[PDB]
Design a protein around this nucleic acid. Structure first.
Ligand code: A0I
Ligand code: MG
Ligand code: MG
Ligand code: ZN
Ligand code: ZN
Ligand code: ZN
Lengths: 425, 513, 417
RNA sequence: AAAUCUUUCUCAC
RNA sequence: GAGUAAAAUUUGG
RNA sequence: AUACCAAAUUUUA
RNA sequence: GUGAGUAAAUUUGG
C-alpha cells in the first residue's frame, strides 16, 4: 500500500517518478574518513577480506608498451568518441536475461574531451596521464597505412594510395535512393524508412557501419531491393585516395556519398580534425556531400547560415573552402541543406559584422577566410614595443605564435597563418 | 609560498574554508545588497540594451525533461495549514511528488498544460489553483555553502519551490537553445579549459584583453530583465508567471519571511542572465559573470564599458584587469599563443581521507597535471613517492592493517613504494589496480559506502530491469508494476536464470573480438 | 510516437481478443501491453494480422515506417484506412467524439496573462543607478602593500608570544612530564573529571568576540606534521592526553553546566579546547613538580578540527617548492631580515595557513595572482582587494592575513615582477 | 572559558 | 544544513 | 521562425 | 515548565 501513500490521490505515475522514489538514501557520516575507517576495524576487516578472497580472482590487465616521440604544444582537447551498444544488440542482451537498466545505460554514444598539451607526429591519442611520455592508444602493413593520411609504402590499392578495392576493404555508397554495401563477396542494399535502416541482413558489418554513420536503428526487411547497381564496376575501378586521416567513423570518402572501410580498423585512433589538417580535410570533401565527421559548436543550422552568408561574397577558392567546411559539419542524411548553392541566404547572418564558426574547438572567422588569411597571408597584431624575455625571433614565414621582430623591434602575435594551416610540405 | 611562485598560482593546495555559522547573516546581506541596488544607488539593474534581434521560440512545442525535476537535492515545500505559511526542507523528488499529488496530474507536463489552459487564476487544478501555486512558488529557504576557496565568508544559497523549479527548467532550456543559436562562439556547455582555448583564438586579433568579472551578479539581475529576455525569445505566460514569482519572492530567514523584490537569488537563471548580455552584442565571450573580451583603443574600451553597463553586467572594479601577454577565464590562464601559463595554476592538494583513496586522488591530480604542462613527469613521480611516504606515516598502525605482504603499500604493512609510471602503465601487482585513476573503487570507498548505506521504512515494489527501449515518460499503476515484474520474472525463469546477471560494457566488449 | 494519441490508442484496443483469450491489439503507450524487447513501429500492434497501426490527422503525417497502417481521422467526422477491418473498428470504437487536444506551445498566451502583467506593472521597479567612472592605472606598488600591512599592525598590534603556534616546536619535556603538566593544568583550571576524562564546563557567554592580535612567528615548526596528526586524532579522542613522538596535546570537550542533570558525553556539535605545550617564557607558563612549560589553548568547533587535521603539510611544501623562487630570511614579525632572519619561519607560515580554518590566505593568493598577471587595473578599487580584515575574525585568521600580505610585500621587495 | 547567538545529550510528565 | 549551472572520472543500476 | 539515470570524487561560475 | 538518567565521538592512530 506504499503506492497509495507516496502518490496519494493518483493511480498512475511516470516511470521516472517511480524510479526516483525507489532511490536508496545515503547518510553522511559525521566523523572524518579516517575515524570512519577505524570504527569497528571495518577497513582492517575489509582489507583482510580483499586479500584473502577478492584479490586472487582479479584478472590481469595488459601492460602498456607502445610509445611515440612527443613534443610540448598548445593546450588542445583530445576527443574520444566511445560508441554505445546498438539497438539490436541491446534487445539481444535484454532478451538473454541481462540487466535492462545497465544495458540501457550503455546504449548511448559518448563523446568526451580531455585537455592535453603534447602532440606526436601522427596526432596520436594518449593514455590518461601518459601524454608526456607518449603512450598511445593505438597498438598487416595495409591496416597501418589505411589509418594514415600519408602511407609510407603504397600497395597499389585504395587503402594505401590510389588504386582499386582489395578484399579486406569494403565500401558503402548511395545510388539513387538506396545504400549499396559491397565487401567483394556479399552485396546488400539498405533504405531509410522513418528512423530505421531497413536491410536484408542488418548484422552485416558494412550495414552496422552505415547504421552508425546515418544515426539509424538497423532493421530486417526482406522487401528491399534496387534496380541499377554499379558496385562491381566501382569495386574494380580505381579512385584517388585523399591525404587525410580516417574520420571518427573509421572510414574515408572516395566519391560523392561513398566511403571505404577496413574490416580490422574499428574506429579512428588519431585526431581526425586538427589546426594543421582542417582545411585539407575541408578541401578533400569539397564536392563529396555531407560527411558528419567534424562536430560544430552551437547550432548546425546557425553554422550553415554563417557559411552561406560568407559564401555569398567570395572568390571560387574561398567558396570551395566554405563548401568543404559545410560538408564537414553536416550530418549524413539528416534534414540539412549543406549545399551552399540551393540554401537560402539569411539576412540576419549578414547583419552580424563577424562570422565565426567553431569546429572541434577551432574558431574560424569566415570573413577572414573570404579575404584569404588562413591559406594566403597571416594576420599580424602588435602586442608591445618592448622585447619580451623568453620569446624567439620572427621567422621569415612565421607560423602562429608570439615572436619578437627586430625589423620593427616589437612583439607580434601571428594568427591565421598559412604556415600553420596550409603547411604545404 | 604561493607569493614566491615564478608562474601563475591560484593557491588551491590547501582545502577550502569550513564554517558552522547560521545562514542568516549571509542571506540578509544578499537581500540588503539587492534592496540597495533597487534604489539605484550602488549598481545598475535597469536593462537598456536592445534584444529585438533574438529569435522567437514561442512556436516550439512545450516539452519538459522529467529527469531534471527529480533529485535528492534539497528544495522548499510550502504548506498553508491554518492561514499561516510553513516552509520545510525536503528532497526535490518528494517536493515534486507532493506538488503532483496536490494537483492531480500524472506528469509535470500535464500539470504545466493544465496550468496554462485554465480560464481563471481561481480555477481549481485539484486541491489548488494557479493563484495559490504562484503564491507558494515565491517562497525560498536559505542555507550556507562553504568549502569554496577564497571565500572566508561562505555564500548564501537558496532552496526553491518545486513549481518554481518546473517553470525555471523550461525557460532555462529555451535560453540555452537561443544561446546556441545566437552566440558568436557558443560556450554554455564547454568546460573551463575549452572556454579558455576558444577565447585565446577569439582575442588574438586585438592588442589588449579585458580579463573581466561581474560583481553582485545575481543581485543586479532584475525580474524586469528576466521578463524582457523571456518575452524576446517568446516564453509567453510561463515567462510572465516566473517573472511575477521572482518579483514577489520571500526568503525564510530563521523564522521570519523577508521580502526580496530585487535580484534572482544566487544563480537561479544562469543562461537567461548570460543571454541578457549576449543578446545585445557579439563582442563578448562569456557565460554568467565571466567574460574575456578584447579591444585595441581606449574608445573601444569605453564602448565595452557602456555595453556592460547597458546589460546589467556591472564590471567588478576589484578583480577585473587588462592584460596583453595572457588571458584568463574560468580560472584558466593561457598565453596569447594558446599555451597554458607556466605554474601550478589551479592544481589542488589532496587531503588525507584514507590509505588508498588518498593515493588514488593524488594519482588523478598528478595525471591531470602531467597531461597538461603543469609539471614534468619526474616531478610527478617524486611527488607520488613523497605522498606514499606520508600515507605510510599516517596509516601504518594496527587499527588499519595487520598485513606484511611484500607487494602491499608501505602504508598497509608492505614494502612496495610504487613508481608513478609503473602504476599508470598497468605494470604493477593487481592489488594496485584500485589505485590507478581509471581502476575500480578502492577498499576504503567500498567500506565508506557500506557504512553510509547502513544508516536507517517501507519500500515501493522495485521497478528495475526494464526493457531498454521503454520510454520513461510512460505511465504505470501499482498493478502495472506488479504485472511487469511478474512477466519479467517469468521470462527470466524460462531462461533458467536468477536475478539478471550484471552487465559490464567493457567486459562484454572484451568478449566480442 | 506521441503521448497525445495514448488515450485514443487505448480506446481502439477495447477488450478485443484473439486466439481464444489473448488480447488482439497491444498499445505502444501501455507499459503492460508492450511486448518487451520488440521495437515500436506504430501506435499499436495487431497480433492476429501482425501489423502496426498508427493514427494520423489530416495533412499531419507521422514519422513511422511505411509498413505501418495509417488510420486517417478526416476533418469531417470519418475515419479512413487502407484496411477495411480497422476502418470498421475505428468507426465503432470512436463512437464518442474523441477530440485530440492540440499541441501546447511554449509561447502559449494564457487567459490571465494580461492580469499578471498588470500586477507586475503595479509592483516596484528598479531605479537606473549611476554609471561608474573607471580609470585604468598600473597595479599597486610596494608602498601600497606596506600601507596595508602597517594599517593592520597599527589597528590590532601584536601578542607577546606565539600562543598555540609555538606548539609547532618542542617544549623540551619528556612524555611523562608532558602528560603530568597537561593533567595538572587541567586540574588547576577546575575542569571536571569524569570517567577518566576532562570536561570544561560553561554557564554564561559574554557574546562578544575574543581579543584579536597578530601572532609573532616562532623560529621554526619541526612538529607541524605531528601537531596536525594530533589534531586529527583529537576529533573523537577528547578528554585524555594524546601523545606523539615529540609532543602531546589534550582536547577537552566544552559542554554546558546545567548543574545536576547535564551533558556527560560529547555529541557531534560539541566544541573542543585544545591544550598544547611549548617552551616557557611567557605569561602562559605553568609549573608543577619542577617541570615548566607554556600552556596554550585553542577553541575549535568540530568542522575546524576535521579540516585542520586532514591537511598534508609535507606534500604541500614539496608541491610549492617545485617552482618556487628563493625564500628570504624573515624576522619574528614577517620583515625582511638578512642579518638575523630565518628561512625556516616560512614553514611556520605554512603551518599557520594549515591552522586557519577560514583560509583567508587563499583569497590573498588569488588577488595576488591577478595582480602579477595584470597590466592595468581600476584605480583605487583593485588595491581594495587586499583589505580582507572585515571578512574574518580571530587571532589565527588575522595573523594568517597579515603574514599573507607580508609575503606579498616580501615578493615585491626581493623578486620584483 | 574561547576563532563567542556557537559550544543545544537522553527519557517521562 | 548545503541550492542553481558546466566539464570530467569511477562505481552501481 | 522551426528543424541516458542515480552514489561518490575533482575542477569551474 | 517539572522530574529523572547518563543510545551516541573515547573503544583503537606515536
Ligand atoms: N557556488 C557558486 C558560485 C557562483 N555562483 C554564481 O556566480 C555568481 C558570481 O559569484 P561570485 O562568488 O563571483 N559573487 P558576485 O556577487 O559576482 O561578486 P564578486 O565577484 O565576489 O565581487 C553568483 O552570484 C551566482 O550567480 C553560484 O551560483 N554558486
Ligand atoms: Mg573573469
Ligand atoms: Mg564576480
Ligand atoms: Zn594497402
Ligand atoms: Zn550495388
Ligand atoms: Zn604564551
Amino acid at each position: 500500500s506504499q503506492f497509495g501513500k507516496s502518490f496519494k490521490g493518483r493511480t498512475e505515475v511516470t516511470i521516472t517518478e517511480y524510479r526516483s522514489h525507489t532511490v536508496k538514501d545515503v547518510h553522511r557520516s559525521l566523523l572524518t574518513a579516517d575515524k570512519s575507517l577505524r570504527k569497528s576495524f571495518c577497513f582492517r576487516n575489509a582489507l583482510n577480506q580483499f586479500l584473502d578472497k577478492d584479490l586472487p580472482l582479479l584478472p590481469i590487465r595488459p601492460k602498456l608498451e607502445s610509445r611515440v616521440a612527443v613534443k610540448k604544444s598548445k593546450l588542445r582537447s583530445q576527443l574520444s568518441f566511445r560508441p554505445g551498444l546498438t539497438q539490436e544488440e541491446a534487445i539481444d542482451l535484454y532478451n538473454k536475461g541481462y540487466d535492462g537498466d545497465s544495458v540501457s545505460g550503455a546504449l548511448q554514444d559518448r563523446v568526451v574531451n580531455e585537455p592535453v598539451a603534447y602532440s606526436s607526429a601522427d596526432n596520436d591519442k594518449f593514455h590518461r596521464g601518459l601524454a608526456a611520455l607518449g603512450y598511445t592508444l593505438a597498438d598487416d602493413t595495409c591496416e597501418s597505412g589505411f589509418v594514415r593520411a600519408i602511407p609510407t609504402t603504397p600497395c597499389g590499392f585504395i587503402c594505401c594510395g590510389p588504386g582499386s578495392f582489395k578484399d579486406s576493404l569494403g565500401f558503402v555508397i548511395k545510388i539513387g535512393e538506396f545504400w549499396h554495401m559491397y565487401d567483394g563477396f556479399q552485396h546488400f542494399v539498405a533504405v531509410e524508412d522513418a528512423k530505421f535502416l531497413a536491410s536484408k541482413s542488418p548484422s552485416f558489418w558494412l550495414a552496422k557501419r552505415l547504421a552508425k554513420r546515418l544515426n539509424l536503428v538497423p532493421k530486417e526487411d526482406p522487401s528491399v531491393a534496387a534496380a541499377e547497381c554499379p558496385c562491381k564496376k566501382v569495386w574494380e575501378a580505381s579512385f584517388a585516395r585523399a591525404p587525410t586521416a580516417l574520420d571518427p567513423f573509421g572510414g574515408r570518402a572516395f566519391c560523392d556519398q561513398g566511403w571505404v572501410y577496413h574490416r580490422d580498423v574499428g574506429y579512428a585512433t588519431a585526431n581526425h580534425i586538427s589546426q594543421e589538417t582542417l582545411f585539407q580535410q575541408a578541401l578533400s570533401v569539397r564536392n563529396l556531400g555531407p560527411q558528419g565527421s567534424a562536430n560544430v559548436s552551437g547550432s548546425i543550422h546557425t553554422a550553415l547560415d554563417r557559411l552561406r552568408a560568407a559564401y555569398s561574397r567570395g572568390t571560387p577558392a574561398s567558396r570551395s573552402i566554405l563548401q568543404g567546411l559545410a560538408n564537414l559539419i553536416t550530418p549524413v542524411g539528416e534534414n540539412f541543406e549543406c549545399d551552399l548553392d540551393k540554401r537560402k541566404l539569411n539576412i540576419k547572418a549578414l547583419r552580424s559584422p563577424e562570422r565565426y564558426i567553431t569546429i572541434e574547438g577551432l574558431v574560424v572567422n569566415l570573413d577572414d577566410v573570404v579575404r584569404g588569411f588562413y591559406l594566403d597571408k597571416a594576420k599580424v597584431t602588435v602586442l608591445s614595443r618592448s622585447k619580451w624575455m623568453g620569446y624567439e625571433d620572427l621567422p621569415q614565414k612565421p607560423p602562429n605564435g608570439t615572436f619578437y621582430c627586430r625589423k620593427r623591434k616589437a612583439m607580434l602575435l601571428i594568427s591565421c597563418s598559412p604556415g600553420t594551416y596550409a603547411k604545404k610540405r | 609560498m604561493w607569493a614566491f611562485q615564478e608562474g601563475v598560482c591560484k593557491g588551491n593546495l590547501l582545502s577550502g574554508p569550513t564554517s558552522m555559522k547560521a545562514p542568516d547573516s549571509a542571506a540578509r546581506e544578499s537581500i540588503d545588497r539587492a534592496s540597495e541596488i533597487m534604489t539605484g544607488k550602488s549598481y545598475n539593474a535597469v536593462h537598456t540594451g536592445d534584444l529585438s534581434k533574438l529569435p522567437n521560440q514561442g512556436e516550439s512545442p512545450l516539452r519538459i525533461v522529467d529527469s531534471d525535476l527529480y533529485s535528492e537535492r534539497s528544495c522548499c515545500w510550502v504548506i498553508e495549514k491554518e492561514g499561516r505559511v510553513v516552509c520545510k526542507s525536503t528532497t526535490l523528488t518528494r517536493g515534486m511528488t507532493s506538488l503532483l499529488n496536490t494537483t492531480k496530474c500524472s506528469s509535470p507536463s500535464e500539470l504545466i498544460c493544465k496550468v496554462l489552459t485554465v480560464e481563471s487564476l481561481s480555477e481549481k487544478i485539484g486541491d489548488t489553483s494557479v493563484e495559490e501555486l504562484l503564491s507558494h512558488g515565491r517562497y525560498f529557504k536559505c542555507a550556507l555553502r562553504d568549502q569554496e576557496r577564497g571565500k572566508p565568508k561562505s555564500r548564501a544559497i537558496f532552496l526553491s519551490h518545486p513549481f518554481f523549479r518546473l517553470l525555471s527548467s523550461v525557460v532555462e532550456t529555451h535560453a540555452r537553445s537561443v544561446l546556441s543559436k545566437v552566440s558568436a562562439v557558443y560556450t554554455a556547455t564547454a568546460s573551463a579549459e575549452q572556454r579558455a582555448m576558444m577565447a585565446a583564438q577569439v582575442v588574438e586579433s586585438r592588442k589588449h584583453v579585458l580579463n573581466g568579472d561581474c560583481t553582485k551578479y545575481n543581485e543586479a539581475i532584475d525580474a524586469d530583465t528576466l521578463l524582457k529576455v523571456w518575452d524576446a525569445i517568446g516564453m509567453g505566460s510561463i515567462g510572465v508567471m516566473l517573472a511575477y514569482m521572482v518579483r514577489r519572492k520571500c526568503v525564510l530567514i530563521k523564522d521570519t519571511l523577508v521580502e526580496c523584490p530585487g535580484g534572482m537569488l544566487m544563480g537561479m537563471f544562469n543562461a537567461t542572465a548570460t543571454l541578457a548580455l549576449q543578446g545585445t552584442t557579439d563582442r563578448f565571450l562569456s557565460f554568467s559573470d565571466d567574460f574575456i573580451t578584447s579591444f585595441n583603443s581606449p574608445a573601444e574600451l569605453r564602448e565595452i564599458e557602456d555595453l556592460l553597463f547597458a546589460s546589467c553586467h556591472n564590471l567588478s572594479l576589484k578583480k577585473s584587469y587588462i592584460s596583453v601577454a595572457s588571458l584568463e577565464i574560468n580560472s584558466c590562464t593561457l598565453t596569447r599563443d594558446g599555451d597554458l601559463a607556466t605554474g601550478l595554476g589551479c592544481t589542488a592538494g589532496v587531503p588525507f581521507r584514507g590509505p588508498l583513496v588518498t593515493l588514488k586522488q593524488t594519482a588523478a591530480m598528478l595525471s591531470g597535471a602531467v597531461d597538461s604542462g603543469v609539471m614534468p613527469f619526474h616531478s610527478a613521480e617524486r611527488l607520488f613517492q613523497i605522498k606514499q611516504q606520508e600515507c605510510a606515516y599516517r596509516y601504518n598502525n594496527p587499527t588499519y592493517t595487520t598485513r606484511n605482504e611484500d607487494f602491499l603499500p608501505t602504508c598497509l604493512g608492505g614494502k612496495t613504494v610504487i613508481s608513478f609510471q609503473s602504476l599508470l602503465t598497468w605494470d604493477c601487482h593487481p592489488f594496485w589496480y584500485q589505485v590507478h585513476p581509471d581502476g575500480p573503487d578502492t577498499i576504503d570507498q567500498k567500506v565508506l559506502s557500506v557504512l553510509a548505506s547502513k544508516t536507517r521504512r517501507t519500500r515501493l515494489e522495485a521497478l528495475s530491469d526494464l526493457d531498454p527501449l521503454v520510454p520513461h515518460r510512460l505511465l504505470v499503476s501499482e498493478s502495472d508494476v506488479s504485472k511487469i515484474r511478474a512477466a519479467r520474472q517469468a521470462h527470466l525463469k524460462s531462461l533458467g536464470l536468477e536475478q539478471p546477471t550484471n552487465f559490464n560494457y567493457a567486459i562484454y566488449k572484451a568478449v566480442q573480438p | 510516437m506521441d503521448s497525445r494519441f495514448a488515450q485514443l490508442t487505448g480506446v481502439f484496443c477495447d477488450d478485443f481478443t484473439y486466439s481464444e483469450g489473448s488480447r488482439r491489439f497491444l498499445s505502444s503507450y501501455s507499459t503492460v501491453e508492450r511486448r518487451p524487447g520488440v521495437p515500436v513501429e506504430g501506435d499499436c500492434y495487431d497480433c492476429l494480422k501482425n501489423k502496426w497501426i498508427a493514427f494520423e490527422l489530416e495533412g499531419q503525417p507521422r514519422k513511422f515506417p511505411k509498413a505501418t497502417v495509417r488510420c486517417i481521422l478526416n476533418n469531417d467526422a470519418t475515419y479512413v484506412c487502407s484496411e477495411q477491418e480497422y476502418q470498421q473498428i475505428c468507426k465503432v470504437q470512436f463512437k464518442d467524439y474523441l477530440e485530440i487536444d492540440g499541441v501546447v506551445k511554449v509561447g502559449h498566451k494564457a487567459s490571465y496573462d494580461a492580469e499578471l502583467r498588470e500586477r507586475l506593472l503595479e509592483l516596484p521597479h528598479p531605479k537606473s543607478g549611476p554609471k561608474p567612472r573607471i580609470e585604468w592605472v598600473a597595479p599597486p606598488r610596494l608602498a601600497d602593500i606596506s600601507k596595508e600591512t602597517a594599517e593592520l599592525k597599527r589597528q590590532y598590534g601584536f601578542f607577546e608570544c606565539s600562543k598555540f603556534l609555538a606548539c609547532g616546536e618542542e617544549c623540551g619535556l619528556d612524555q611523562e612530564a608532558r602528560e603530568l603538566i597537561l593533567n595538572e593544568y587541567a586540574r588547576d583550571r577546575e575542569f571536571e573529571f569524569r570517567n577518566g576524562g576532562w570536561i570544561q564546563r560553561y554557564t554564561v557567554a559574554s557574546h562578544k568576540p575574543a581579543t584579536q592580535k597578530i601572532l609573532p612567528l616562532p623560529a621554526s615548526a619541526p612538529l607541524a606534521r605531528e601537531l596536525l596528526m594530533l589534531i586529527a586524532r583529537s576529533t573523537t579522542q577528547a578528554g585524555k592526553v594524546l601523545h606523539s613522538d615529540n609532543t602531546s596535546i589534550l582536547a577537552v570537550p566544552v559542554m554546558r553546566d546545567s548543574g545536576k542533570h547535564s551533558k556527560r558525553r560529547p555529541t557531534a556539535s560539541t566544541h573542543h579546547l585544545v591544550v598544547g605545550l611549548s617552551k616557557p617564557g611567557c605569561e602562559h607558563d605553568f609549573e608543577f613538580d619542577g617541570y615548566r612549560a607554556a600552556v596554550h589553548v585553542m577553541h575549535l568547533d568540530p568542522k575546524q578540527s576535521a579540516n585542520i587535521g586532514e591537511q598534508d603539510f609535507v606534500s604541500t611544501r614539496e608541491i610549492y617548492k617545485l617552482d618556487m623562487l628563493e625564500l628570504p630570511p624573515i624576522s619574528r614579525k614577517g620583515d625582511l631580515d638578512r642579518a638575523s632572519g630565518l628561512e625556516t619561519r616560512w614553514d611556520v607560515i605554512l603551518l599557520l595557513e594549515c591552522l586557519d580554518s577560514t583560509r583567508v590566505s587563499q583569497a590573498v593568493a588569488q588577488h595576488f595572482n591577478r595582480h602579477r598577471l595584470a597590466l592595468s587595473v581600476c584605480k583605487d578599487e583593485f588595491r581594495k582587494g587586499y583589505q580582507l580584515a572585515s571578512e574574518i575574525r580571530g587571532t589565527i585568521p588575522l595573523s594568517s592575513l597579515y603574514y599573507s600580505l607580508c609575503a606579498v610585500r616580501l615578493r615585491m621587495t626581493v623578486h620584483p615582477f
